[PDB]
């Protein structure tokens, strides 16, 4: 509940403008009907973006650090699951990946 | 079944201490030796310390339910590296490296 507060703090700095040249493609769902991704709900069962766990978030229904960090690492293995690892979507993924992890480990 | 699971995990286990990712795998292969290294504060730091080997005995000994479980420690090895270590230092840069090959193996595990 104070641990939260930080992983909201988090969430934040995830969404904050020094990313965005790689964060973007996670600030919304992925578009798969207009992308012509036919296939992405047969894979991604779950799907899960920035914009879906900050309604969480707000909606309290994050009950520990750990509830928070399931869905942000989903968001990612989505991406990875889905697309080929060559692909720069995927470069960008590792890429917000590695200061999620950075925030998080740090996190008191 | 859910031991399909696990040999799949195995199979990531493999990858991670290979030949091809050894140049950045080598830190995370056994414990860190923290009384060699000279680090008064290590396990003051880390609480619960992990690394591969480690992760090999437990895979072996069977106290793995399921991947979710197996991922849990795998990911609990980088983050005590990244809790630990300044962002800039080589250390995380392999971490890093090593992380990214991970998640893909592990987002590929049917
Ligand atoms: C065009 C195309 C896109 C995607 C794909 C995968 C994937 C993904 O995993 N995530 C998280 C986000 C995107 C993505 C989403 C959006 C919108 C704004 C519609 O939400 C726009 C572009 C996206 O993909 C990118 C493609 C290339 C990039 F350099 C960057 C992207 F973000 C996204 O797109 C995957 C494939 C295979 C693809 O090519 C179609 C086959 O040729
Ligand atoms: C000497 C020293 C080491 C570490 C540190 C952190 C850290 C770590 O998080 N992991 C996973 C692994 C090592 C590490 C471990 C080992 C052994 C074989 C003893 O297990 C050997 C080297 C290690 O890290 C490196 C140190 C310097 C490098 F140029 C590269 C390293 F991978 C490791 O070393 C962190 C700091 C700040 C440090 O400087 C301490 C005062 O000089």
């Known amino acids: 509940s104070e641990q939260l507060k930080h992983c909201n703090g988090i969430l934040k700095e995830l969404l904050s403008k ?3 040249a790689y964060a973007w ?3 919304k769902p992925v578009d798969a009907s207009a992308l012509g991704l036919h296939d992405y ?7 899960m973006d ?3 766990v900050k309604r969480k978030m707000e909606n309290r229904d994050y009950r520990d650090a750990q509830e ?3 869905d942000v690492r989903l968001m990612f293995s989505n991406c990875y699951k889905y697309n ?4 720069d979507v995927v470069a960008m993924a590792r890429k917000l990946q590695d200061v999620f992890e950075f925030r998080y480990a740090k996190m008191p």
Do not use: E, G
């Not at 709900?41 to 799907?47: E, F, M, Y």
């Not at 080929?84 to 692909?87: A, G």
């Open 84 to 87: 080929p690892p060559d692909h």
């Open 41 to 47: 709900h047969d894979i991604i069962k779950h799907p």
């Open 18 to 20: 020094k990313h965005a």
């Open 25 to 27: 493609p996670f600030y």
């Open 50 to 52: 920035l914009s879906t």
């Open 68 to 70: 928070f960090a399931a």
